[PDB]
RNA sequence: GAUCUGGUUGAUUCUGCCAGUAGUCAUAUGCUUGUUUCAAGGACUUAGCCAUGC
RNA sequence: AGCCAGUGAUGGCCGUGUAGUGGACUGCCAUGGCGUUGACGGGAGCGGGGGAUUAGGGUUCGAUUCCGGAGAGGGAGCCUG
RNA sequence: GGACAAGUCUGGUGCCAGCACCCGCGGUAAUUCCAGCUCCAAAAGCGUAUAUUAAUGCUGUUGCUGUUAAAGGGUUCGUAGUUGAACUGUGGGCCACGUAGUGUGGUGCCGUACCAGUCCCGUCCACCUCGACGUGUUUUGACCCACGCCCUCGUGGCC
RNA sequence: AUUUACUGUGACCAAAAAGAUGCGACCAAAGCAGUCUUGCCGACUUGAAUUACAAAGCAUGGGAUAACGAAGCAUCAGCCCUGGGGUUAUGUUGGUUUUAGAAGUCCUUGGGAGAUUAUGGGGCCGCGUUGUUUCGUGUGGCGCGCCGCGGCUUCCAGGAAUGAAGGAGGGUAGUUCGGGGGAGAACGUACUGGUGCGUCAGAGGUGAAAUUCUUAGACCGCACCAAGACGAACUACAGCGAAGGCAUUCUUCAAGGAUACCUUCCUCAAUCAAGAACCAAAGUGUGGGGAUCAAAGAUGAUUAGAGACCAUUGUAGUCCACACUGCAAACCAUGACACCCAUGAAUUGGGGAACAUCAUUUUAUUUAUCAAUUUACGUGCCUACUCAGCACGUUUCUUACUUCUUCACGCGAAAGCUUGGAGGUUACAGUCUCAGGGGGGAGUACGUUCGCAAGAGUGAAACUUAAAGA
RNA sequence: AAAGUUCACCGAUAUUGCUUCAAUAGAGGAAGCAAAAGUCGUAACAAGGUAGCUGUAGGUGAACCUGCAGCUGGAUCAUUU
RNA sequence: GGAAGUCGGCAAAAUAGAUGCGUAAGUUCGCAAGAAGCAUUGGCUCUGAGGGCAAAAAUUGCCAACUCAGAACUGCUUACGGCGGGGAAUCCAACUGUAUAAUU
């Protein structure tokens, strides 16, 4: 119901400071804890090495194999799972290749029916995965 | 306990006009209450009123003519610079064509239209329309 | 509402609008002052002096005739009580309750009421120290207060 | 521009979030690129290490 | 949730040192000084003029052209002026 | 396909391959996948990722919610803090003249109504003719606004 | 002695950037330039003028506020005049000495003031105990008038202060009101166990049984004894308490609210981090006590099974004293204080009217706009005294818990709320305080304070989800 | 007037020891979240077949059962006038 | 060199007084504790503080005792006696005490 006092500025300032920690959006941007757990060091992209090609089953209502990959990041030696989009496009990737990884669209949240994947492959050997798919370039 | 005589009086008048009464009794009275009522009466919103003496804070009986839609006090009494009249009119009034904001200035208690003519600011007391 | 309860009591007296004394009184201002000083000699509080005048000698208010209040008259004559009357009556009540609590240690209801009365005393003493009716550095203690009281 | 829309039910009216939408002399990457004017350009990480010339 | 005093902490007296004032520093004396109107400790961070978003109130950015401060691998000392 | 502008077109695949920010599509007639043809947006530009502002009255001073959706302390006392009743008081004259509400009195006063008289019917329900009061005028006078002047601008005290 | 906040007007405030005047760089993003009378030039060319929190500084205004002071006998001296008393300047500098002022300090005349009456106390005592004013010349109303005296003396300031909030506190009264609280003494049946008599074959328990007691006399009947708990019916949309809670009688102790009042006082107040006290049942420690019921345990059933529901038992507990604990669907799932608010029946306490007891305005012939008096009314019991008493009937008032199924606006997503709000809120501002921000992980982990323990308070994240919910 | 001697002061650097912060290996013991339409039962939703739920204490393969006080969010707004 | 000796650090070595600063886990809140650990210590010449008794009294005079705290100068061959080594854990017994005179 709040004060409304005309000399109660201190009470109002203290009230807003305490109650601003109760929303996840404000807390996440001010806490430095999600940044440390983020495999990317607060960046939009990262480079890594391919360790293995794996198949991830889709969630229950759907039924498919999603053709993901396991990548170790160069900057801090963390392991993640990245999705490889588009038809085929797994034949362009080999073990020990160098890839560029970006996020999905939901800022660290898993998307679609893929269980726990929040990254996707963007470049391989510094050519461009979608360009290879449309045959505009050849893999070096 | 009661902390504002002016706020108490304006709530009694606005409540009575909502119910369509002809007269209302206000208790207790004060100098600021009488001045506020004289501004409303001058513009033709209430009519005749009478003060009864009891050797304490008095009592007021007000006659209502049915022209008053709403009146109310503003707490706390914010300061209003002479260039800030448009901001208050936009916020608490139905339009820019009628209605008044009542201020207390060093020249006395007056509506915002008279204060603009005399070029004085002050502290906002209330409103009516 | 009451200071220390939930009761909403309205019982009180209503003074009249007309302040002039009636024409049948026929009692001078000097006579009223003499009657007030006699009763204080007998040892009555200002509240009891006013009731005695009202009930027997037909004086409705001691301010409407002689133009002075009862406690002001006593102060001028030098017969005012050492501590304010309302403060004294509260200290006396607390003393009686403590005496009862010495023998009865299971009276949790009386212990609760003692807390309220002592809280009222400390609030009253704070006001009287500010308006300089009590000397500064005046304190109420349960051990000492048994004295200086009825 | 003082503007909102999709998802909880066999249907209804809510609370509430998730998703959509517009900008950024705001960075990076992909595809594409005929003419002209004006412009920032190893800050982010490593106040890390330096051939040569000035 | 308490901080500061052997070895300066707050103030006083006579001095020394400085271009000059000063617990800046030597000797002696008193017990002071700060704090829920958030001291002490911790985290991020060069400050400002300003930029972005514009019903209004606000939220957020400012290493970077102008002004001020600091540094020249780290950290200490110094001559000439 | 919807949000969201634009096909109930033609082949292939058959819960596979894949699409899909969200809802969802795909097991033999797929408006959603892979393609062809048409069409849409904005265009020398257009997608994607991360951060931030608006959308957000989902941080609410302006401006949120608290019976049952998340949310009133088990109850009293109580310090710092915030908030706290009324009063000392805004004057009066003189003209002028368009207002200007009211009372008090002037002046005449068709018609209507009322009271008091006279006669007359009735005994349960009706009428005639006069000596005044009203109603309606017209000024005075006290409230009101506009415009000038004056005031030792309460009383008192000088002149 | 008067001061701040607020408000009007001006001072002091780098540029760039931002708002703005002017100029056809071909337009524009720009820039501060440029134009033409055809110039040995001119326009005395231009390049205006703004905003910039908060603090500071100058001079207006005094309505709302705020900082001071005071708490009213801790006070109050009344003004002007005339007659008395007891540093200059002497030509300059340096020394001695004076005459006067002024000041204070006591007497006295002149005058006018006063915001509160020289007339207040004694004694020395002695004496005796028809003129205005209404109202119709006149009438009628008119209002005023038609231990007492006495001279003296001494002492004396004792009346000048807003008012008493349908704000708080205190006082007196009905020895009012009530399952309110603490102490003693007793009372009542019942469950259980004994004792004494009588009788004789079963009693108990269940849906049906069995475990169990019984000719060594159970169950049943009468009388009595012992110990512990509990106070039925009356008992209610009733009372009291801050909540948790409180039910036999009598005797005691201190309190509490409401009502009544021409008592007193004069802002003493509301809400509250920190802090304090109390707080159901279970549970804990040390002594008592131990009738009933009964976690754990035992036995009999039932069942596919039955560590359960049913039956017979049975320990801790259940009760008291003194210490702890502070966890409830601790609920009205509804924070405290204050204002306004329509209707009809009821109810709990106090008071007024009534009953009973005592005592013995004009007017007004010709009117009316918000009336000048709706105030009315009886019953039963009652000395061959907790009594001028006790109930009932009728009309008002203050306080409290409520109802409408013959309760209005208004509000709400709805169910519903409604003088007691969940109303008076997008027509959004009376005051203070505590919580919430999608569902889970979770009131969990870690750290710290409190506790004998059981626990209590404070209190995250990584991850995971598109709904959960009303 | 150079080298050089002694003392005071400023003080880099190294070693040792405390304090503080940030990341990190671990046999074993647990908790949470998912998947697979695995095994045992049936606690809740109807009086869910013993009404349900809160606090507390004990017990048991699992859901749960039992004792004491409370609530209706009940399966009763209700019966000596 | 530093336990490689040995069943076993047995025996020996080793710590050490006083003063200033500082001190962990655990805990029945009393302890643990001298926990752990760092620094100073001579000689000589000086300075300050800590009192009684008298007097016509913040004054003057007379006088006793041995502690504590500082300064300058100067020195070391680390130099009598006496005087705890410390820490991290497991098993048993709560603790002080008694007890096989002559192997426990
Ligand atoms: K000095
Ligand atoms: K030079
Ligand atoms: K097909
Ligand atoms: K909300
Ligand atoms: K017990
Ligand atoms: K049982
Ligand atoms: K609780
Ligand atoms: K009652
Ligand atoms: K159950
Ligand atoms: K079931
Ligand atoms: K239970
Ligand atoms: K130890
Ligand atoms: K011993
Ligand atoms: Mg209170
Ligand atoms: Mg259906
Ligand atoms: Mg930095
Ligand atoms: Mg900068
Ligand atoms: Mg940086
Ligand atoms: Mg730049
Ligand atoms: Mg640079
Ligand atoms: Mg430098
Ligand atoms: Mg470098
Ligand atoms: Mg489509
Ligand atoms: Mg469409
Ligand atoms: Mg997107
Ligand atoms: Mg097809
Ligand atoms: Mg935002
Ligand atoms: Mg908005
Ligand atoms: Mg809830
Ligand atoms: Mg509550
Ligand atoms: Mg006020
Ligand atoms: Mg500019
Ligand atoms: Mg009062
Ligand atoms: Mg028996
Ligand atoms: Mg009974
Ligand atoms: Mg108990
Ligand atoms: Mg026991
Ligand atoms: Mg139990
Ligand atoms: Mg049973
Ligand atoms: Mg039994
Ligand atoms: Mg008990
Ligand atoms: Mg609650
Ligand atoms: Mg609602
Ligand atoms: Mg609501
Ligand atoms: Mg509001
Ligand atoms: Mg949440
Ligand atoms: Mg402990
Ligand atoms: Mg225990
Ligand atoms: Mg806990
Ligand atoms: Mg049943
Ligand atoms: Mg079941
Ligand atoms: Mg059941
Ligand atoms: Mg159960
Ligand atoms: Mg060996
Ligand atoms: Mg060997
Ligand atoms: Mg040895
Ligand atoms: Mg410790
Ligand atoms: Mg030691
Ligand atoms: Mg032993
Ligand atoms: Mg021993
Ligand atoms: Mg032996
Ligand atoms: Na739902
Ligand atoms: Na060209
Ligand atoms: Na070109
Ligand atoms: Na910054
Ligand atoms: Na600089
Ligand atoms: Na917002
Ligand atoms: Na029981
Ligand atoms: Na309840
Ligand atoms: Na009602």
Radius of gyration, alpha carbons of chain B: 15
d(CA B112, CA B127): 10
- Beta carbons of B46 and B94 less than 8 angstroms apart: no
- What is the tally of helices (H) and strands (E) in chain A? 4, 5
User: Residue C69, class by beta-carbon neighbours within 10 Å (0-12 exposed, 13-18 middle, 19+ buried)?
Assistant: middle
- CB count in 10 Å sphere of residue B125: 20
Query: Nearest nucleotide, C1' to the C-alpha of B9?
Result: G339
d(CA B82, CA B79): 10
d(CA C65, CA C28): 8
- Beta carbons of A81 and A52 less than 8 angstroms apart: no
Residues in contact with A12: Cβ distance below 8 Å, sequence separation at least 6, in sequence order = A2, A3
- Beta carbons of C67 and C33 less than 8 angstroms apart: no
Query: Nearest nucleotide, C1' to the C-alpha of A116?
Result: G464
CA distance, residue B79 to nearest chain A CA (Å): 11
- Beta carbons of A65 and A56 less than 8 angstroms apart: yes
Looking at chain A, which residue has its C-alpha nearest residue B76? A6
Strand H close to A36 by CB, under 7 A: yes
User: Residue A96, class by beta-carbon neighbours within 10 Å (0-12 exposed, 13-18 middle, 19+ buried)?
Assistant: exposed
Q: Tokens 């993901």 map to which residue? A: A68
End-to-end Cα distance, chain A: 68
Looking at chain A, which residue has its C-alpha nearest residue B74? A4
CA of A47 to C1' of D30 (A): 16
Chain centre distance of CA B97: 18
DSSP letter assigned to residue B52: E
- Beta carbons of B89 and B97 less than 8 angstroms apart: no
Residues in contact with B124: Cβ distance below 8 Å, sequence separation at least 6, in sequence order = B74, B77, B78, B80, B88, B101, B102, B103
For residue A41, what are its two tokens?
A: 């060091």
For residue A134, what are its two tokens?
A: 């449309």
Strand H close to A115 by CB, under 7 A: yes
d(CA C131, CA C133): 6
Contacts of B76 in chain A (CB under 8 A): 4-6
- Beta carbons of B26 and B58 less than 8 angstroms apart: no
- CB count in 10 Å sphere of residue C53: 19
For residue A120, what are its two tokens?
A: 């996707």
| Cis peptide, bond prior to residue A31, ω within 30 of zero | no
């Amino acid at each position: 119901t709040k004060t409304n006092g005309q000399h109660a500025a201190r009470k109002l300032v203290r009230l807003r400071r305490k109650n601003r920690w109760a929303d996840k959006g404000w807390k996440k941007s001010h806490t430095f804890v999600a940044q440390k757990a983020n495999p990317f060091g607060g960046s939009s992209h990262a480079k890594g090495i391919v360790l293995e090609k794996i198949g991830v089953g889709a969630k229950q209502p759907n039924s498919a194999i999603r053709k993901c990959v396991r990548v170790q990041l160069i900057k801090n030696d963390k392991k993640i799972i990245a999705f490889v989009p588009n038809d085929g496009c797994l034949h362009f990737i080999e073990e020990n290749d160098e890839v560029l990884v970006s996020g999905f669209g939901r800022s660290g949240h898993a998307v679609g029916d893929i269980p726990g994947v929040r990254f996707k492959i963007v470049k391989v050997s510094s050519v461009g995965l979608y360009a290879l798919y449309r045959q505009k370039k050849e893999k070096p | 306990t009661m902390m504002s005589v002016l706020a108490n009086a304006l709530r009694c008048i606005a409540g009575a006009e909502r119910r369509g009464k002809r007269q209302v009794l206000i208790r207790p009275s004060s100098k600021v209450v009488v001045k506020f009522l004289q501004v409303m009466q001058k513009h033709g919103y209430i009519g005749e009123f009478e003060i009864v003496d009891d050797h304490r804070a008095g009592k007021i009986v007000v006659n209502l003519n049915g022209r008053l839609n709403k009146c109310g006090a503003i707490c706390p009494r914010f300061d209003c610079t002479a260039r800030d009249f448009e901001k208050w009119v936009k916020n608490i009034l139905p339009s820019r064509q009628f209605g008044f904001v009542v201020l207390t200035t060093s020249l006395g208690i007056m509506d915002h239209e008279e204060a603009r003519a005399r070029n004085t600011g002050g502290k906002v007391l209330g409103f009516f329309y | 509402v009451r200071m220390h309860g939930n009761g909403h009591g309205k019982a009180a007296s209503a003074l009249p609008y007309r302040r002039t004394p009636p024409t049948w009184l026929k009692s001078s201002s000097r006579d009223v002052i003499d009657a007030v000083c006699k009763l204080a000699k007998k040892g009555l509080s200002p509240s009891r002096i006013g009731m005695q005048l009202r009930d027997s000698m037909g004086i409705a208010q001691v301010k409407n005739v002689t133009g002075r209040k009862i406690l002001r008259i006593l102060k001028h004559k030098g017969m005012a009580p050492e501590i304010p009357e309302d403060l004294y009556c509260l200290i006396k009540r607390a003393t009686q309750m403590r005496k009862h609590l010495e023998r009865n240690t299971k009276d949790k209801d009386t212990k609760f009421r003692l807390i309220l009365v002592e809280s009222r005393i400390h609030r009253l003493a704070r006001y009287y120290r500010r308006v300089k009716q009590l000397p500064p550095t005046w304190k109420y203690e349960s051990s000492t207060a048994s004295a200086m009281v009825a």
